[PDB]
Amino acid sequence: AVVTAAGLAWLRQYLNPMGPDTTSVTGYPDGSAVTTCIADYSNTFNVSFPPREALYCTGSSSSEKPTLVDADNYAKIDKWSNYDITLCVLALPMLRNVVMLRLYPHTPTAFALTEQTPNFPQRFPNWSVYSADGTRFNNGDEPGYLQSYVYLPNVDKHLSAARGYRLLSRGITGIFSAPALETQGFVTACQYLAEGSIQSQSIKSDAVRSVTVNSDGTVKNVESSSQTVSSMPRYVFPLDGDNCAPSSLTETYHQAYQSKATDGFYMPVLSSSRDNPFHPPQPRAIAVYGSFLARGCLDPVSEAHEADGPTHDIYRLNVADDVAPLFNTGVVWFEGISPKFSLKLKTRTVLQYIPTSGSVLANFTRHEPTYDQIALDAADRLRNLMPHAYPAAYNDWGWLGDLLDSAISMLPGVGTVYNIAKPLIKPAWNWLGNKVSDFFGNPVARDG
Amino acid sequence: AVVTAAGLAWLRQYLNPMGPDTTSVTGYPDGSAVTTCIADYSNTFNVSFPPREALYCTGSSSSEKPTLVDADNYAKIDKWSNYDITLCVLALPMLRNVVMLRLYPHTPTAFALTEQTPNFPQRFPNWSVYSADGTRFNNGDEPGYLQSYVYLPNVDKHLSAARGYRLLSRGITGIFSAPALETQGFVTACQYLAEGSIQSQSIKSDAVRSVTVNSDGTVKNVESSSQTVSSMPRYVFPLDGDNCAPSSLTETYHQAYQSKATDGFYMPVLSSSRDNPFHPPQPRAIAVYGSFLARGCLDPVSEAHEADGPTHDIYRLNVADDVAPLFNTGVVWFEGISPKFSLKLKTRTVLQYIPTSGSVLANFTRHEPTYDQIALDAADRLRNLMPHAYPAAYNDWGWLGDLLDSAISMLPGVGTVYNIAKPLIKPAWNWLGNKVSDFFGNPVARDG
Amino acid sequence: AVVTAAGLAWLRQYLNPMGPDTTSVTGYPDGSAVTTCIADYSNTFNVSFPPREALYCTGSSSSEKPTLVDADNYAKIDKWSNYDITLCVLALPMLRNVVMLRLYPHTPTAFALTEQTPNFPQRFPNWSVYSADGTRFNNGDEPGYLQSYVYLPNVDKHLSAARGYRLLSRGITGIFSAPALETQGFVTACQYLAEGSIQSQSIKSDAVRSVTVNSDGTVKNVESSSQTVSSMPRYVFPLDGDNCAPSSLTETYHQAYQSKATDGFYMPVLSSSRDNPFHPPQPRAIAVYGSFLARGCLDPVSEAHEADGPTHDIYRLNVADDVAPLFNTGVVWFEGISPKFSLKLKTRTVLQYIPTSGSVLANFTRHEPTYDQIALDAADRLRNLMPHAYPAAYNDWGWLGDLLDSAISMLPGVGTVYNIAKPLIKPAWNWLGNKVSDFFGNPVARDG
Amino acid sequence: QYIPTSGSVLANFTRHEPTYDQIALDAADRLRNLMPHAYPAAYNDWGWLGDLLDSAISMLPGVGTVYNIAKPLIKPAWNWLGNKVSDFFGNPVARDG
Amino acid sequence: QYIPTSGSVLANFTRHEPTYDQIALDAADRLRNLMPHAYPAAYNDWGWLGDLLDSAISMLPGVGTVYNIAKPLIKPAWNWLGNKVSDFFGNPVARDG
């Protein structure tokens, strides 16, 4: 009838993954009664404007040939460096490939994605170029943007050796810096659930046409294999790419975070569900789910037009991974950034494993199947009222824990002993105008 | 620890969508903290025996040609009009295409469905004819029944412009009338969860057979492409068509509603789940899930017979839509109806949207992310004890709200302050014999 | 605010399916308000070392020919009978085919499964032989192990005649015996959730190659159909076959049961979820989910290598069934068993039906849609702290019910009236060393 | 009721409480001669049945009686043709259909 | 505000509470002649508005008044050029931009 210590610790690391006090690492409070090993991956990447040597092309040029650097089309990308730029990060719930970095000459109207599968998507220090017309880039085209994946290798190496896993928490911090007199820019952050699923797109086969004209050979096998079948199963994410523009996100979600660029960001991605069960590792090809062109049988049609129905485009990412289901997809945008910026990305991913016998993880297990129902209910309660992100320097929340968690742990049901803990009001997170008030009306003087 | 006003209003519109007091429209009480726009679609259709001009044929006759009216086989359908008829409505959870109307010469043994995909299914004012042998109808066959879809166009137009949606409530009313001295007939209504899912049926490819007999041409590519693959993914509904006969529904479900025909009906379709999350629009081809013929590997067989296993027939509807998951499928039957009847269908569908930026919905948003846990728990509690339908004129329930909702809002957990609200007894909804008693023993004198 | 009698009875049969006091049969406490019929299937099988007449081969030898007995390779299996053996039973949640028996000459390193689909898997009295190299067995190979399915025919016959079903409880008892002076051996038991799903494996089509060399015939249709498509949908179980070795199971799960062989076993398989909804019968081909060989797009690759990505092997069982979702998969191992053993398997499967009108089940319905929330919460609570199995003779648990269920029914939320029921401690189930203590510290003197 | 044959289908549906109640049998034998042979098709859920008729008549058999007096029992008048129907306790029957 | 035409797009967005409030209309008619015609672009969220100005002026109309006295109302001085701005209750306006 009261939150335990372990449940409270889990709640604190789940809501504040990169808070300074989160030193101990604790598991999900459900009493799984299974030997588990919890791993904490902290990584840091200094991302800036890439030089030409780390810049490959995804077109059919690098199709069978390995990665092809840019044949000194880098002049156009220098032209980008003349003006201000835009930098998106997209944190899908994939376990490895923690985030997708993307660099634009200027803010796009939507999070476009190429129809054709790219060639050799590049891990972070390298980038891959895409054309301005939303197609893959071969040398001699017009570069549209740069893209890269931030890859955690230890996560792969450990996920190989595990019966099951579950993501405990994940946080991404964006310490931003730029030369003095060029600190201009804005930052926007938003989380939302993009519930992926294993789907296969609808494709067509090819009808064989043989015309034997020989004196005895007159078979004429004109049989039509050109029917509609299902492609490979892929894990498909329904992120509304057309609606991931910054302004749309700000006006849609009330917990979205906005600030000047120098504040950076700190996104503690949150689970969208209430239970977090173990899953066997299942690396699959990831794809992102587009829109449909032909209305098809959305209108009265014939049998022949049942096939070309509302089939949504599926954009292959050419990246395989296993995803943490029920976790929010995060996205931040930096607009009007000076091209000679410097973003220090810090990712902290803590996740639980069930070690496979004889594997490396077996030597690190740590056994307390603690149970705490109240912590889970409190997390489900708090999901809908935490801000989506905070300034990069905003850690060690005074309101968290002894105040917010305690005040909200008395609401669930009537599992309450303390009569009243503390009144809870609606916080006002106006970082742009320095009028920030936390959940209890206390103001927030600037700590950076 | 007490139901709010907004939660109560949502509960009232969810349980009584077409009640007279439901003037205000309110959203799902989960505090989604998202800019939302709630739309209320009220539609009315006067359905009667169709004339010949509004009656098309679905056979291969109208395959590439557009819809083909009946070549004055309408004499047989007049013969139908000689005797009494039967009228089914099937309310699947599809957002548009609110209901499926179907007209039978006499009550069928099951809700049959054609194996071959029909041609040009018709929106309500028009109908489409199907043969008596459970096949599509070409001119010169024996007509078996008529079918049509009741289509809401504004729902489509708005669903185009939305990031996400969720169905809040849906009600269907069936005001029935007929000439005096021909009021004879019966009405039956039942709801049940038919949990659809995205499935692909198993089909076969075609093996190519080339016999080059030329002096140098002797390739003989006899390779067999005749393997088993997966067809298009479709949203498949597991409605037991073989068991949707009226009598079976009455004897299976205790909340099923039965009455004389003149009472009409009023079905407030209910959600089968406890949470109602947003979903991106996903129009897919709808299909209904049949039964299997060949037992296949249900018995010890060889590899070659693994393929022809228990593959269930999938009946394509040739209709594309996106469905409200977790909502019950409703069905009503009118038996022994005078053929010159008149049914006024009134559908009220209220559903929430997340507007896309710049779309029309953006001008109508209305922002109060109210939270009310007790309302959700009360709805989950009440799901299993509300009647499936009421007489068409039975609105403004005295027992609802101040009595039923209040009495049942004290059960959940022990989140209770008022000591005792009101004893709750088992109601007796015997509309046929005029012995109706509500949830508190009060009787129901006839209001129509 | 207190557990009902019906809820308590359901809890007792769910946790102790084969306890002597479980005479009455009761349904799931959710108040489904549906006409239901509960069936109780109790079966007994005396399994021992099979003789040659009941021993078929699964290789391509018995491909189109029906089952083929062993062409007196039975000498090698007698050689097995010279030494000690190993006997696994694998209780997947399939409704019919209650368990899979498997016999090994000596303990394997993993629960291997053949890549090629076997021929004519045999029901229990017969067995099917598999080669030592993990392939199907034709006469003249090296036999690796024997396998059979324990099939319940009445379950099939009743599942044909039902709108919907749900598994209420299932227990498997393993009364073990052997000639005196040969009682040596060990027994291990473990349950774990293997959440299956309808998946289709990725396969390839075949590219047609026609070279018309005729004077007028020069078509040369070289079109490539050799693309990647999806195979048949199958219900796929993610059981970690590589990690089902006995020692790994013992060291992974803390509730795993270990004892000397003569103790037998008694596994009350438990649901892994909290709600148990009805489902329509859906017999599908069952398959077990393997591992992947080629890393594919787990590394930066080209489009052509997106196809050969991490595709996991799917082992077809050549058995069709419909499964009880959310129920644990059980597995027991008997090591070092004298080859002339005798295992009396007793399975009790109790499950609910919604009868189809006019079917046989309709004559046996029994209507009390009892509701009991507390029983469901108590079951969810108890899931994680019950032992996975008990000695075959350990029934009629004193601690169960009046003590364990009562003590734990006061924890959920604060729905508690009795101040304190009884302190609950951590039980110590050390059956090997005769130091067994139940949940309240009381010891367990040996009852057999 | 059935006694299932071993291995038959009925064996899977058995339901075991050999309840004994002598008073119910005596009450049924008593009531046999004074129940109407039929009722209108819509006449179910008899108010007089059970808590009133069965209780009132369960005290007659022998002297196996604890409650002093339950309720006086009169001769009902089932005149369905003329809408003058009175049940076993004089209460009238307004038409329910 | 709109009255939607049947079947039109607006019909899907209707929102029904025909609220009546006479006092609000009278207060608006009263306030029309004494509000400034415009304010500096950054001058929003008026402290004097509503709880002070509307409340103080809602007691004037007729004698439909319950609260004895709300707050004295003086003549504001909107001198934005010289930074000598005083609102309707004499409180000054320090520059917010």
Numbering used by the authors:
A (entry chain C), B (entry chain A), C (entry chain B): 66 to 513
D (entry chain A), E (entry chain B): 417 to 513
From the paper:
The RNA genome sizes of LSV1 and LSV2 are ~5.6 kb, encoding three major genes: the Orf1 with the unclear function, RdRP responsible for viral RNA replication, and the capsid protein (CP) for the host recognition and viral capsid assembly. CP forms the capsid shell that protects genomes and is responsible for both host specificity and receptor binding to transport the viral genome into infected host cells, or for intracellular trafficking. We determine cryo-EM structures of T = 4 and T = 3 capsids of virus-like particles (VLPs) of Lake Sinai virus (LSV) 2 and delta-N48 LSV1, belonging to tetraviruses, at resolutions of 2.3–2.6 Å in various pH environments.
The LSV2 VLPs reveal structural polymorphism of T = 4 and T = 3 particles according to EM images. From ~11,000 particle images recorded on a direct electron detector with a super-resolution mode on the FEI Titan Krios microscope, the capsid structures of LSV2 VLP within T = 4 and T = 3 architectures were determined by localized reconstructions to 2.4 and 2.6 Å resolutions on averaging around the icosahedral symmetric axes, from a respective single dataset. The models of T = 4 and T = 3 LSV2 VLPs were built and refined with the homo-trimeric subunits A/B/C or D/D/D. Each icosahedral asymmetric unit (iASU) of the T = 4 particle consists of four subunits A, B, C, and D, whereas one iASU of the T = 3 particle comprises A, B, and C subunits with the C/C dimer taking up a position similar to the C/D dimer of T = 4 particles.
